[PDB]
Design a protein around this ligand. Structure first.
Ligand code: CL
Ligand code: CL
Length: 124
């Protein structure tokens, strides 16, 4: 249940654009190819079997799909923890990326992370 899920992770999860998923918090601006400060997690509020895969993609109007590293994780106890997601492709200082989340239930569901992320060679 959402109340129970919030209660396992108080103060750590944010809405996605889908009522069925929450996520951990990403930086607003990060350095290309740098390890993230908070390992990314996608949390299912609904039933998602263990082993269900989750993949993320990043892009914008200039770049349909920016390079990522380690952009797939598997659900376990309704949480998919990405061990080492990295943002490699750069948005530049003037634009940011939207991060789309795909959860490979049958059939797959798509969610979007709740903020844009800027990726530059130097970072913030
Ligand atoms: Cl790229
Ligand atoms: Cl850049």
């Amino acid at each position: 249940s959402m109340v129970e899920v919030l209660a396992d992770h108080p103060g750590e999860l944010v809405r996605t654009d889908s009522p069925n998923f929450l996520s951990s918090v990403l930086p607003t601006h990060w350095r290309s190819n740098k390890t993230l400060p908070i390992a990314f997690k996608v949390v299912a509020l609904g039933d998602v079997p263990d082993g269900t895969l989750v993949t993320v993609m990043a892009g914008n109007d200039e770049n349909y799909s920016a390079e990522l590293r380690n952009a797939t994780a598997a659900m376990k106890n309704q949480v998919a923890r990405f061990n080492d997601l990295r943002f490699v492709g750069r948005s530049g200082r003037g634009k940011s990326f939207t991060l789309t989340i795909t959860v490979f239930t049958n059939p797959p569901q798509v969610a979007t992370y709740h903020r844009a992320i800027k990726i530059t060679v130097d970072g913030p």
